[PDB]
C-alpha cells in the first residue's frame, strides 16, 4: 500500500483541506448577523467541545485499521457497513455544488488580465441603467432597483438570471462555464492519475500560497486610516443576541462545516501510516490554525467595507445582506475599482479561491477513491487508472444540473440542505457506534501505545457525552425552524422546499437499507442476528 513520506507534506494536505471557500462565506456573512463580536465567543467555546472530538474521531478511527472507509466497519461493527456508501452519495451532491463555484473564480481570472477592468464603467453590454455606484460630489440616488457594477458583474454577467424566472423553468447552456469545468477536473486528474506520492511533491507549495494573500491584502487596507474607522464600529459589543438563541445552534454547525469530519477524507489520509507520537500534534495545530484562519479570513473582508462605508455613510448591515455568496464577489470587486492599485491584486486575488478550490477537490477526492479501491482488488491491481477516470466522468454529469439550467437556484438550495441533516445524520451514527456499542475502554488500550500516554481525562468525557449532545441540537432545531431561503428577491415555492428536504433525507437511506439485507439473509433467532451482526456484543 502507498505511503506519504515527509511529515509536513502530510499535515499541509489537512491544512489546505480544512480551509474552504465555505469558511470565506458562511463565517463572515453569519458573524455580523449574530452580533458580530458576540459570534466569536460561541465560536471558541463550541470549537473546543464541539470541534475537537468529531475532528480527531475520523483521524483516530482511520489510524487504527488502515483498510479504507467501507471495510473499516467490517471489524468493529459490521452492522454499520452502510456509512461508506452514505459518504459517497452525499459527496456527489456537494461536488456539483463545489465545482460550479470554481468556474466563477476561473472565469474572472481570464478577465483580470486586462489593465482597464470592466468595473469602473458599465459598458454597452450590461444593465447599465441601474449602475449607480459612483461616489461623486453628492450625486447618489438610492432606489429600490439601484445596483452596483459589481452586482451586475455577478447578477447578470455570469449568472444571466434574468432569463430563468425560477425552478419551474430552465435557461440556456452557457459554454463559458462549460469550458471552466474542463480545467477544474483537468488539474485534479493529473495529480491523482499518477499516484499518491505525487501529492508529496506538488501541493506542498500550494498550502503556503493563500496565507500570504491575507497578509498582503490586509496591509493594503491599512494604508488609509479611513478603513480603520469602519472595523471599530463593526466589532462593537452586541450582547443582546446571546440570550435569544436564534441560530446560535447554527454557530456550532459552522465549526462542523469548517473542519468537516466524517467524510472519510482524514481516514484515507491516516490509512497509509501509523503516525506514532505525532498524530495528536497534527490535530491540535489544525484546530487552532482554523480558529485563526476563519477569524483572519473575515477580518480582512470587512476591512474593505470600512473604506466603502466612509463615502457611503451607511451601516454595514444594509450592505451585502441579500445572499452569502454575493458578498465576496461584490465586496472585493468594488475595492480594486476605487483603489489605484489595479492590475496587480486582481490576478493575485482570484488565484486564492482557485488554489483552495484545487486543494479540497483533490484532498477530498482521496477519501472516496481510497474506499472502493481497497475492497476491489481486481480493480486496484490493473484497472486502477481506468476506474478512477470513470468516477470523474460521473462528476461533471451532475454539475450540468446547475450550469445547463442557467440559474443559481441549485446553489442556494444546496447550501443548507446538502450539508444539513444529510452529513449530520451520517456523522452522528459514526460517533454513537464507536463509543456505545464498540467498547471505548478497549479502544484506548492500543491507541495509548501509539500516543505514548493514556488518552483519559480528555477523551473519556467528550466522545461519550459531548459528542452526541451538540449533534442533537442541530437536527431537532432544523426541523422545528425551516430556514426559508431567498435569492435575489425571490421566495421559493413551498413544494420546492420539499425537494431539498427529501434529497437530503433520501441521501442516507442506504444506511437503514443494507442493514435489512444483512440481517434477513442471516438465519437463526432474533438475538443471534444481533450477535452475528455486531461481533463485539
Amino acid at each position: 500500500r502507498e505511503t506519504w513520506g515527509k511529515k509536513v507534506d502530510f499535515l499541509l494536505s489537512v491544512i489546505g483541506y480544512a480551509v474552504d471557500l465555505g469558511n470565506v462565506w458562511r463565517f463572515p456573512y453569519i458573524c455580523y448577523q449574530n452580533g458580530g463580536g458576540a459570534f466569536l465567543l460561541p465560536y471558541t467555546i463550541m470549537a473546543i467541545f464541539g470541534g475537537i472530538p468529531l475532528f480527531y474521531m475520523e483521524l483516530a478511527l482511520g489510524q487504527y485499521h488502515r483498510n479504507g472507509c467501507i471495510s473499516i466497519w467490517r471489524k468493529i461493527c459490521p452492522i454499520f457497513k452502510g456509512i461508506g456508501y452514505a459518504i459517497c452519495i452525499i459527496a456527489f451532491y456537494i461536488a456539483s455544488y463545489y465545482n460550479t463555484i470554481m468556474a466563477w473564480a476561473l472565469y474572472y481570472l481570464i478577465s483580470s488580465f486586462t489593465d482597464q477592468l470592466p468595473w469602473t464603467s458599465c459598458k454597452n453590454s450590461w444593465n447599465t441603467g441601474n449602475c449607480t455606484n459612483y461616489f461623486s460630489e453628492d450625486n447618489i440616488t438610492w432606489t429600490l432597483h439601484s445596483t452596483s457594477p459589481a452586482e451586475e458583474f455577478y447578477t447578470r454577467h455570469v449568472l444571466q438570471i434574468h432569463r430563468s424566472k425560477g425552478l419551474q423553468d430552465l435557461g440556456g447552456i452557457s459554454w463559458q462555464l462549460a469550458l471552466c469545468i474542463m480545467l477544474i477536473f483537468t488539474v485534479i486528474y493529473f495529480s491523482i492519475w499518477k499516484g499518491v506520492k505525487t501529492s508529496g511533491k506538488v501541493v506542498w507549495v500550494t498550502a503556503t500560497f493563500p496565507y500570504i494573500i491575507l497578509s498582503v491584502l490586509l496591509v493594503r487596507g491599512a494604508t488609509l486610516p479611513g478603513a480603520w474607522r469602519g472595523v471599530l464600529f463593526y466589532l462593537k459589543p452586541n450582547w443582546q443576541k446571546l440570550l435569544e438563541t436564534g441560530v446560535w445552534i447554527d454557530a456550532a454547525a459552522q465549526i462542523f462545516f469548517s473542519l468537516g469530519p466524517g467524510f472519510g477524507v482524514l481516514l484515507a489520509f491516516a490509512s497509509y501510516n501509523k503516525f506514532n507520537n505525532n498524530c495528536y500534534q497534527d490535530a491540535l495545530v489544525t484546530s487552532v490554525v482554523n480558529c485563526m484562519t476563519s477569524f483572519v479570513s473575515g477580518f480582512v473582508i470587512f476591512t474593505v467595507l470600512g473604506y466603502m462605508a466612509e463615502m457611503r455613510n451607511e451601516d454595514v448591515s444594509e450592505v451585502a445582506k441579500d445572499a452569502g455568496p454575493s458578498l465576496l464577489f461584490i465586496t472585493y470587486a468594488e475595492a480594486i475599482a476605487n483603489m489605484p492599485a489595479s492590475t496587480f491584486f486582481a490576478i493575485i486575488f482570484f488565484l486564492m479561491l482557485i488554489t483552495l478550490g484545487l486543494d479540497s477537490t483533490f484532498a477530498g477526492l482521496e477519501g472516496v477513491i481510497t474506499a472502493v479501491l481497497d475492497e476491489f482488488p481486481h480493480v486496484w491491481a490493473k484497472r486502477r487508472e481506468r476506474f478512477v477516470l470513470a468516477v470523474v466522468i460521473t462528476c461533471f454529469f451532475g454539475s450540468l444540473v446547475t450550469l445547463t439550467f442557467g440559474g443559481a437556484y441549485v446553489v442556494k438550495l444546496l447550501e443548507e440542505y446538502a450539508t444539513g441533516p444529510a452529513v449530520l445524520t451520517v456523522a452522528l451514527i459514526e460517533a454513537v457506534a464507536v463509543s456505545w456499542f464498540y467498547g471505548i475502554t478497549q479502544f484506548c488500550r492500543d491507541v495509548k501505545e501509539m500516543l505514548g500516554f493514556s488518552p483519559g481525562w480528555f477523551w473519556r468525557i467528550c466522545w461519550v457525552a459531548i459528542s452526541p449532545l451538540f449533534l442533537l441540537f442541530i437536527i431537532c432545531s432544523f426541523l422545528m425552524s425551516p430556514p426559508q431561503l431567498r435569492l435575489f428577491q425571490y421566495n421559493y415555492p413551498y413544494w420546492s422546499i420539499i425537494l431539498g428536504y427529501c434529497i437530503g433525507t433520501s441521501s442516507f437511506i442506504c444506511i437503514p437499507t443494507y442493514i435489512a439485507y444483512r440481517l434477513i439473509i442471516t438465519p437463526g433467532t432474533f438475538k443471534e442476528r444481533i450477535i452475528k451482526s455486531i461481533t463485539p456484543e
Partner: antibody
Amino acid sequence: QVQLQQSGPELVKLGASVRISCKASGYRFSYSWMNWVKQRPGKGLEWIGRIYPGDGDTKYSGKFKGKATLTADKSSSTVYMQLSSLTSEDSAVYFCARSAYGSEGFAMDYWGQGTSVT
Amino acid sequence: DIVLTQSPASLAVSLGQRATISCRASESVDNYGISFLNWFQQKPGQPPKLLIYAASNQGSGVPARFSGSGSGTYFSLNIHPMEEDDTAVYFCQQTKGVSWTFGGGTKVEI
C-alpha cells in the same frame, strides 16, 4: 425632456477644423453613453464613436478614427467633437445621439435638431 | 464588422395591408437573451424616431402597429395595416460592440 441643442453650421475648407457642440440635459447625462451619426442626401446612416462624460472612453471604426476626436466635460454638461482635415465628402449633417440602457436593448431614444456641415 | 442587408428594396404597402421587413446578418448576435437589433423611423428632414425596443417590445410614443419577433439570423418586422403618415425609411440597428453597423434600407411606400 429633449434638450440636445447643437451649435450652428460651419464652412468646410480643405484642412479645416470644426468644433461641434451639444447640450447634455433633460436626463442623467453622467450615466449614459453619447454617440454621433452621419447622414447625407441619398445615403443612409453610419455610426461614428462613443464617449462618456466623466471617463472619456472612446471606440472608433468605419475609417473615422483617422481624424475623430471626442471630448466631454461632466461639469459643463456638454459633449464636443473635433474633426480636423475635412474634405468635400465630409459635408453632411450630424445628430447628437444618445443610446438607452441595457434594460431595453440600448436603443437611441433622444436626438438633436442637427447641424449642417456645409 | 457585422454585415447587414435588407430586402425587398422598395415595398408598395397599400392601405389596409400588413408589411414584412427583415434584417439578415452573418452573426450570431444573440447574447444575454436580448438580440441587439432595433428599428428607427427616418422621414425627410426629421431625425430618427425609435419604433421597437430590442425588436420585440413596443415602445412609448409610437403607435401599436409595429411589432417584431423571430429567432436566429432572420427576423421580420410585422406591422399592422399601415397609415399614410407612417411613410418612412427604416434601418436595422446593431449595438454589439466594438464596431457598429446599420442596414442598407428599404423604402416603404404605397
